[PDB]
Design a protein around this ligand. Structure first.
Ligand code: ZN
Ligand code: ZN
Ligand code: ZN
Ligand code: ZN
Ligand code: ZN
Ligand code: ZN
Ligand code: ZN
Ligand code: ZN
Ligand code: ZN
Ligand code: ZN
Ligand code: ZN
Ligand code: ZN
Ligand code: ZN
Ligand code: ZN
Ligand code: ZN
Ligand code: ZN
Ligand code: ZN
Ligand code: ZN
Ligand code: ZN
Ligand code: ZN
Ligand code: ZN
Ligand code: ZN
Ligand code: ZN
Ligand code: ZN
Ligand code: ZN
Ligand code: ZN
Ligand code: ZN
Ligand code: ZN
Ligand code: ZN
Ligand code: ZN
Ligand code: ZN
Ligand code: ZN
Ligand code: ZN
Ligand code: ZN
Ligand code: ZN
Ligand code: ZN
Ligand code: ZN
Ligand code: ZN
Ligand code: ZN
Ligand code: ZN
Ligand code: ZN
Ligand code: ZN
Ligand code: ZN
Ligand code: ZN
Ligand code: ZN
Ligand code: ZN
Ligand code: ZN
Ligand code: ZN
Ligand code: ZN
Ligand code: ZN
Ligand code: ZN
Ligand code: ZN
Ligand code: ZN
Ligand code: ZN
Ligand code: ZN
Ligand code: ZN
Ligand code: ZN
Ligand code: ZN
Ligand code: ZN
Ligand code: ZN
Ligand code: ZN
Ligand code: ZN
Ligand code: ZN
Ligand code: ZN
Ligand code: ZN
Ligand code: ZN
Ligand code: ZN
Ligand code: ZN
Ligand code: ZN
Ligand code: ZN
Ligand code: ZN
Ligand code: ZN
Ligand code: ZN
Ligand code: ZN
Ligand code: ZN
Ligand code: ZN
Ligand code: ZN
Ligand code: ZN
Lengths: 148, 148, 147, 147, 149, 149, 147, 149, 147, 147, 148, 147
């Protein structure tokens, strides 16, 4: 049963990490599409705050402790690190693709762990997010591609 | 009197055709402006569904039969054919310009036929659409142009 | 068969029902004309949405949606109707058969999705199974006479 | 008649139909009572708007609207109804005849307006011509049996 | 000896119709600086008369008698004040509406007394709701017409 | 000699519960072309019964007696018409609802008379509001069932 | 029990909780009266929705819902409450026990649904399992003392 | 021999003003864990008192007497309970508001009796609407103060 | 003259009235200050919209809109006012003359549009003709004294 | 006065104006009755908000608000009104004098706040200074005759 | 005291000027971002109409006369003049940057004049606008920049 | 110190409080669990907004916002809490200390802003000073016992 709460706790830390990272994209993008990227990443960091809270509260429902220490959040984060603080629009979209691919893989890991424990609530939460990101990733991939 | 219902029936088939075609643009556009083109063509195919229904129902009001067979719709369609299934944003906008120019010419044909029959209801329907497309085509032309 | 093959079948069927549901909408006759006209309007709107959802899922899955109307026509397998004038009870009976067809296809889609471990497509199929099971209950009752 | 004479005729008729549509609204009996009650309520509200619009167009054109109910009574020419009890089908048949009358009167108004180059009245006539042609289609389909 | 609830409602039906027509006269034909506010006020007023007409008719039908369906009968039965004018200043309209509302109020009081003698709680509540409405409106209209000390 | 307001409200509580259950039977089990409109009408109806149940209970509590909290007592005390059917045509449902509403109306009139003898203005207003509601509804239901001349 | 037997059990129980939650709603006393009154009102509205949903799922599955209140009374198995007066804490403790009962019953419904490959009922069970697991967490925290 | 409707309304005007001021005292000066919910409840309450003040004044004016316009007269005429406190626990506020509402309720009952003797349906309806409001509120406030069996 | 020439004239006039209508809005004095201030606010907002619509129609028609304020000033031909303090009745009388001017220009635009078979510009002119005919009726009545 | 002494003065005055504005609201007579009735209603609602805001700012600053109506009566210094019947123009003239009084008191509050480096009270003063300067302009224009 | 009303009157004339100029951008931009620039400049000219009215009405509150003559508005305008009537999207954004920089400098001039007169109402109006334009100018500058 | 240095300090503090306010939100125990949970949700949402506003002001001022969580952690100076279980009164007492800290920092920001003649940052600081002065009043009263 610890594997479900272990994976929720991993996601809590990654959600925090992406919330910080998505602010970086939001502030520091430059170029003609500044405003739409700014608005896009604003919605995205809001989703990461919500995801942060949901993972924590699911852990609590499952009888464990959520992470409450900045230091632990920082140490446990495993989503892609970025060294930049200035971006083109296409660079942000490419970075987000990578961040969403990481989230997608981690949600499928959560689903499996939920499956082994017969945890339908956590499985439903995982799968709603899998659907959300497979849809976004299709759109992001099309945004990065050139036409034949 | 058959010329008004003949032209409404032509438009019914073209509206169906453009509804299918506009999905093609909606799905298969690639590049940075993916999302706005996707949203734009979504509104456009909704207008073509509405146009499909309006033409059919006007024919019925005029005492004739709307087309109800896929095969007849396909055979009767005369709006521009496209062979592609992958597009740049500028390519979609250029294709839509051509589709809207075709609609505009066909609505003016409908207006004339309505005029000869003193059909004020069909004439009003034609003219509301002429105004709509002359306005859109101005915007689309500006979108495709370079500045002096 | 496969998730993408089944999605493409449903895309073609959604287009066919979108067209047929307009025939019911336009051509029903009788005292319940307006309620039937309104009902079929909402139904065709759902068929348009289904058409789009099926295509986009195929695209998300790395395959091409159908974009040619001739292919849509050739591939559709939902019930054919060679009438263009209906009573309200005839429309309801036809919609029942159309919804029985969709429900069976959604169940095939779910099976295919569970085999492929595709939770997203499975969730899509299951939401539709629930929608049609409920709607078919009400349609059945509409067509019955009491005990 | 000239545009104003025709507007004044339509003012009288809108008043007459407003009264009559209340008769349908109150006095229909049978399973579809509530839908007819609701439809006829919308219809009389439309007749009240029509009455005001005709009158105010007359005032815009420099003439006096009808203000005496006795004149309104004497000038009305829309179909007379003797009954005070109806089936839903009878009401729909009577509304069709009322709407046919209005539609023909709006066409007379339009011709009159066109001759006087009165674009405002013409646009008002044509907007209503469109409204009644659409309704009359639906009403016709409602009274039909399927073939 | 006064007429029953149903005959009072029938009278009220005929008057509401008459006032609906009459209020259009004020709506169309007022002249002067306050044209628009009088036009809007009288539009709300005729809409209330249309509603009253339908309410009285439907209450008569609920009580088992038939509503009036003929415009000749509506015209002959109306007893609300007539006006032989088709042009008005704003003060004239306000004065005339005061007379119309005083008339309505008096008739709603008769309606209430009839409803009470018949133990008709539904019609009594209907009458009293309206009595409250015109007592308030008449206070405001009276203040609009008065001169300050 | 008739029972007090509080005992009448307690009866009304039990009936509202019974009709809430019964209206679900009509909601679920009507069959025929008008299935959906009957399904929706009866859904609005049971929601009104749920509200009535809570209102009567809370008024009894305001008057210092205790509401019924046991389903066995609710079942034993209900006096509204029973139906031994679980399948209905649309006309059957309309006919049966007419009988249920005529029952309610008669009980709300008793409630009003009891409230008046007790000078209970709150309960009287509550009863009369409901009397007005069912008199209107019963007029429409009766018209729905009649045949035109 | 099979899916329908289990749905019918939950129909009876939803009815029972609807009644009981009114008892909490009316009869709580103490400083938090109004918030408990409001919370329990939302809770009984949820029980009324649950009652209708179970019944209609049964009808969809081809069986008859419970229509006799005597059957509803006899089949209910959720916790019995003898009292008719409560403190806010007592109400919260009693609701926790009611919600634990429901949560266990929804899990039985889900297992039953999964065995019958009934995705619609399964989704309905799991949606409620999620709802009660979340509520029960909050309720538990509400009854606790801090460490 | 009891005072007329108009003098009762004038009393009610003065009290509503007093309670409007007093309810601010509870609003500002409550202390303790339930500070915010008491602050909000008493804000809704003073807003109701402001409305009552205006309603009573306007009804007096409709009845042809003049409303009170001087704050010295408002202060001298108020008879609702005074409180010589400017700090409160939540339970104290609830207890004090119970006393204020019991006072209002008793005065609205006198208002109703006066309105009935005068056949003043408008004021009677106004009084009874308010009687219904405080009977419900007082039930809830009483439950908030009680201890469970 | 031509549709585009007439549109450009109206563009210049819309700008002029937009400015003048602010003068009425700011500088009216007297008891009806606020209603006049609100009325003229809505009116200048319509002038801004008219300015934009006229320019964009010229652009749709392949010609250049006016973009220089000196050209706008030189070309405006609506009534000049050399006052900056007004009574409410003076504002209404001036607005009447401004609206009579606009109505005549809209009629010229319609004629030009019908000659050019330009249904879009004609519809634009006719919607405005109807708006101003109605508004001038009400303004006239505002300025009259009763019989 | 210090900031709190000045806030307490404004608390008393807001109470006084709340009462007075009801007098204007009830007792105005003449053609503009309804607009004055509506304007003064908004005005007293503003005075009630002002009364609460001053009191709560005092509480924030560590002092006690006024709770006794006798103190409120004795401390009020806004213009005394003896009348209980008014023309619309008289009401507007009296409101101008009330608003001038408030505006001067808000300026005193601002100076006091600035001296104490109290940004919160200062911002509150200045927001109201802006409000009354704008209103007083409109009120002035309303009382004027045009030149 | 004349320096506050002098500066409000300068701003009234510039607001009028920018309202005309912003229509020029709105109509005459060409290129892929036509529609968003069109929408952006539409909001901007609405703000300039509002600014025009606010400056005028503040002058009137201060006991002076607003400008009511087109000719005076034209003569007094000092915001940047543009000679073009056709623009790329980036050209419009660059021109707006310059127009907003001018507004920002003029609002700070207004604030100072308000300060010297203790005019808190005009100072508040100035400062609300300073905040608005410093925020917009940050966004506009990022839109024009390239990433490091 | 400087405006940008103070803004960066507050950015780090906003992040720290955002995290801590979630601890209160999750881990409070007792009868007021839900109101405290809702209160702290709104509070953390304000901390997220504050984080963003502080960063964007620094960027507007030509400097870089903090984008590394290690820097955020190192720089935060708001009160540390080494508990993860709370009563409702403990949460309120901690929030009081957190809000006292923010208020003092906002006052330093205002001073720095006025020195730099930065009206925009000063307005930001002052709106927050007013918000926290009011909220601390209410929190204080929540923690008191009456006289
Ligand atoms: Zn932003
Ligand atoms: Zn944003
Ligand atoms: Zn957001
Ligand atoms: Zn949370
Ligand atoms: Zn830590
Ligand atoms: Zn491709
Ligand atoms: Zn999409
Ligand atoms: Zn979309
Ligand atoms: Zn859409
Ligand atoms: Zn259709
Ligand atoms: Zn076919
Ligand atoms: Zn060019
Ligand atoms: Zn349709
Ligand atoms: Zn429709
Ligand atoms: Zn639709
Ligand atoms: Zn799509
Ligand atoms: Zn093809
Ligand atoms: Zn059966
Ligand atoms: Zn009705
Ligand atoms: Zn209705
Ligand atoms: Zn209606
Ligand atoms: Zn009208
Ligand atoms: Zn007459
Ligand atoms: Zn046929
Ligand atoms: Zn009108
Ligand atoms: Zn109107
Ligand atoms: Zn209206
Ligand atoms: Zn009716
Ligand atoms: Zn007749
Ligand atoms: Zn007179
Ligand atoms: Zn008598
Ligand atoms: Zn007097
Ligand atoms: Zn249902
Ligand atoms: Zn339903
Ligand atoms: Zn419902
Ligand atoms: Zn309740
Ligand atoms: Zn029991
Ligand atoms: Zn029968
Ligand atoms: Zn008896
Ligand atoms: Zn009959
Ligand atoms: Zn309640
Ligand atoms: Zn409630
Ligand atoms: Zn509810
Ligand atoms: Zn149901
Ligand atoms: Zn039974
Ligand atoms: Zn603990
Ligand atoms: Zn407050
Ligand atoms: Zn509050
Ligand atoms: Zn409030
Ligand atoms: Zn009032
Ligand atoms: Zn005094
Ligand atoms: Zn005590
Ligand atoms: Zn007595
Ligand atoms: Zn007890
Ligand atoms: Zn203004
Ligand atoms: Zn305005
Ligand atoms: Zn506006
Ligand atoms: Zn534009
Ligand atoms: Zn120029
Ligand atoms: Zn005249
Ligand atoms: Zn009032
Ligand atoms: Zn009012
Ligand atoms: Zn208000
Ligand atoms: Zn307050
Ligand atoms: Zn005192
Ligand atoms: Zn002057
Ligand atoms: Zn545009
Ligand atoms: Zn736009
Ligand atoms: Zn806009
Ligand atoms: Zn203005
Ligand atoms: Zn000039
Ligand atoms: Zn850079
Ligand atoms: Zn939560
Ligand atoms: Zn929450
Ligand atoms: Zn939130
Ligand atoms: Zn941001
Ligand atoms: Zn880092
Ligand atoms: Zn104390």
């Amino acid at each position: 049963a610890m594997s479900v709460t272990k994976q929720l706790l991993q996601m809590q830390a990654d959600a925090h990490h992406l919330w910080v990272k998505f602010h970086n994209y939001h502030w520091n993008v430059k170029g003609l599409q500044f405003f739409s990227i700014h608005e896009y990443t604003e919605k995205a960091y809001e989703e990461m705050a919500e995801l942060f809270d949901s993972c924590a509260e699911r852990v609590l429902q499952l009888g464990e402790k959520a992470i409450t220490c900045q230091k632990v959040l920082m140490e446990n984060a495993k989503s892609p690190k970025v060294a930049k603080d200035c971006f083109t629009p296409l660079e942000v979209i490419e970075l987000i693709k990578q961040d969403y691919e990481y989230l997608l893989a981690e949600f499928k890991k959560l689903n499996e762990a939920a499956e082994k424990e017969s945890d339908t609530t956590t499985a439903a939460f995982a799968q709603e997010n899998i659907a959300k990101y497979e849809k976004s990733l299709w759109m992001i991939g099309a945004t990065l591609q050139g036409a034949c």
